[PDB]
Each structure stands twice: as structure tokens, then as C-alpha cells.
Amino acid sequence: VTSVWTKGVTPPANFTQGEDVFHAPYVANQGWYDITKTFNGKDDLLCGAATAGNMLHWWFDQNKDQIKRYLEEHPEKQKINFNGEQMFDVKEAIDTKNHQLDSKLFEYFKEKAFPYLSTKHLGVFPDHVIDMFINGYRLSLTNHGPTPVKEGSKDPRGGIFDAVFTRGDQSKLLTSRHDFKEKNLKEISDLIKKELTEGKALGLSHTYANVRINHVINLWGADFDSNGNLKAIYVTDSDSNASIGMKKYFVGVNSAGKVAISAKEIKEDNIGAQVLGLFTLSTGQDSWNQTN
């Protein structure tokens, strides 16, 4: 079963069959991240921002040098203040990126950016958060589609790298979104293998047992069978106990004809959770030069 991993990520080698799932406990600097929720009332339903946070940690690694030279050029983009008080320091985020429970980035998302979302039982999408953070695109909670590549004022909460990744320059948009709205195993399998192959960071949405019935997780690697169809995916989930880490999910067509994922084999007794869509993040490594 050929497999494909995210650019710059080392496949874990400490997988173990657990009580309920086959997993690999988190290990820092391995290339992947597992921002874990503390369900402190502010992040309870922010799996979106957590996935977005994990994609950004990977992004930090991939652009370590460029980001340094960037903060050298534009010192004021390093910190974000709100009428006298500091709301975020991107350098703190970078120093703590490896932390599952108290990274500075997720703390920023749950405490200052999207606080009142988890006490209101509706959340945020991965690509919207990243587009805001990097480019500065204003994030609307009433917008239910792709980020409009239009020009405009920067979101006070982000646009840290908007000197380079501007708003309106479509070639400076690093994210994407894809709906699995009734497509098949093959179509979904090809799209995932593709984005991985093109060197992007991936996020995956699926049905839950909650109100919305929607959840978001990071997809780090995939195993395909002889016909190119997906067999499994390795993921991190911010809902998972911090001791779990990287999980292995089974991928198959359920009894209702839905492509679904589950910690256990997909059978009649196990229909799993249907997958809904996909979000991507590209490094944007060839868009840093401003003298172009």
C-alpha cells in the first residue's frame, strides 16, 4: 500500500494498538503538530482554529528563514497591540509551536481572536483563519464559502505577513477549500494524494455526533491500495487526549454509500464518520521576494 506524507513530516515509528485506536504518541520536532483543547469554555468548539493552528506550525518550519528576514524588514508586524495592550507576539508563537496544550498561537485564537465562539455553539473554518492570520483577510462568521480574493482593510486580528501576502493578489492566496459533496472514493483519494504530493498541509472535515454534526482534523499522511484508492489516513485531532497523538483512521465506503473514516475497520457494525471536505495550505516559499 503506497503511502504519501505531508512535505517535511517524519512518519512516526512509535505506533501502538491502543484501547480504542492505533496511535503514535506525540514527539516534538518530527514535523507534525497536535494542538490539544483544554475545553476551558473558549476553545470547546474551536477544532477549526486548532487545525488552522497546526497547519501554521508546519508553515513556520517551512519558512523559518524567510519569516526571520521578514520580521527584520517589518519589525512592527511582530506584535499585535490593541489600544495599549499586547494581544500577540508571533515570536512567542514560534518558540512554543511544539506545545500541545499551551502553545502561544492557540492561546491567542481561543483567548483573543475567537473567544466567544465556543460559548455560542457554532465555529470557524481552517482556511478562513489562516487567510486572516497571514494575509489579513477579514473573517466573517456569516460568510459560508471560499475567501473572497478582493482588496480591503486588514483584519485587526491578523495580516501579520500582509506586506508580502497581500489581499487581492490571487497569486498570494496560500489556502484552498474543496467540498466532497457527493463525490466518490476515487475522486476523494486522488485529491488528497494530489495535495499531499504538491507539498501542501491538509485539514479534513467530517460528521460528528454533535449539533452541527461537523468536526475538523489534520491529515498528515495517507495509504493507498493497488487501484489508487484510499485505505487509511494518519491524523491529529484536537479533541483527542494529549497522550494519544497521531491516529490511524480506516477509510472505506459505508452502508449508506458514504466515504467514511473510523478508528476501527469500516463494516456494517461500524459505519464511521462521513468525510465532508478538505482545506489546504501551501508554503508560499516562492512569494517572499519583494524585489521581484
As a three-state string, the secondary structure of 144-167 is CCCCCCCCCCCCCCCCCCCCCCCC
Range of the domain at 183: 1-27+174-282
Q: What is the DSSP letter of 188?
A: H
Grid coordinates of 99: 506545545
Residue that finishes a domain, picked among 173, 192, 224: 173
Three-state DSSP at 12 gives coil
| Co-location of 47 and 16 in the same domain | no
Experimental technique, in short, is X-ray
Structural domain total, the chain: 2
Check if the beta carbon of residue 153 is closer than 8 Å to that of residue 146: no
Q: Over the range 75-108, which residues count as b (16 or more CB within 10 Å of their CB) and which as e?
A: eebeebeeeeeeebebebbbeebebbeebbbbbb
CATH number of the CATH domain containing 15: 3.90.70.10
Residue that finishes a domain, picked among 173, 197, 230: 173
Q: What is the DSSP string of 225-252?
A: -TTS-EEEEEEE-TTS-TTT-EEEEEEE
Helix (H) or strand (E) holding 189: helix 185-197
| Co-location of 77 and 4 in the same domain | no
Q: What is the DSSP letter of 104?
A: H
| Co-location of 166 and 35 in the same domain | yes
Question: HSE (CB half, 13 Å, CA atoms) of 50?
Answer: 31
| Co-location of 185 and 255 in the same domain | yes
Distance CA 281, CA 130 (A): 8
Kindly state whether residue 291 falls inside one of the protein's structural domains. Answer: no
| Co-location of 56 and 134 in the same domain | yes
| Co-location of 219 and 102 in the same domain | no
| Co-location of 255 and 140 in the same domain | no
Q: How far is CA 114 from CA 16, 27, 44, 131, 158, in A?
A: 35, 28, 11, 15, 12
Helices (H), 8-159: 47-62, 64-73, 90-95, 104-108, 126-135
Distance CA 165, CA 132 (A): 11
| Co-location of 66 and 80 in the same domain | yes
Residue with cell 508580502: 164
142 φ/ψ angles, rounded to the nearest 5 degrees: -100, -5
Check if the beta carbon of residue 63 is closer than 8 Å to that of residue 285: yes
Distance CA 9, CA 21 (A): 21
Check if the beta carbon of residue 3 is closer than 8 Å to that of residue 226: no
Distance CA 286, CA 68 (A): 15
Distance CA 127, CA 149 (A): 13
Partners of 236 in the β-ladder: 218
262 φ/ψ angles, rounded to the nearest 5 degrees: -160, 155
225 φ/ψ angles, rounded to the nearest 5 degrees: -90, -170
Kindly state whether residue 292 falls inside one of the protein's structural domains. Answer: no
Partners of 60 in the β-ladder: none
| Co-location of 95 and 147 in the same domain | yes
Distance CA 277, CA 53 (A): 18
Contacts of 33 (CB under 8 A, 6+ apart): 53, 54, 57, 58, 97, 98, 100, 218, 236
Contacts of 251 (CB under 8 A, 6+ apart): 185, 230, 231, 232, 233, 259, 260, 261, 266
Check if the beta carbon of residue 174 is closer than 8 Å to that of residue 203: no
Check if the beta carbon of residue 174 is closer than 8 Å to that of residue 282: yes
Q: What resolution in Å is listed for this PDB structure?
A: 2.4
| Co-location of 54 and 161 in the same domain | yes
Q: What is the DSSP letter of 116?
A: G
Neighbours of 207 (CB within 10 A): 17
Grid coordinates of 169: 493578489
Check if the beta carbon of residue 3 is closer than 8 Å to that of residue 193: no
Residue that finishes a domain, picked among 173, 202, 222: 173
Distance CA 94, CA 97 (A): 5
Check if the beta carbon of residue 33 is closer than 8 Å to that of residue 225: no
Kindly state whether residue 59 falls inside one of the protein's structural domains. Answer: yes
Distance CA 86, CA 95 (A): 17
Kindly state whether residue 6 falls inside one of the protein's structural domains. Answer: yes
| Co-location of 118 and 240 in the same domain | no
Helix (H) or strand (E) holding 194: helix 185-197
Residues in the chain: 292
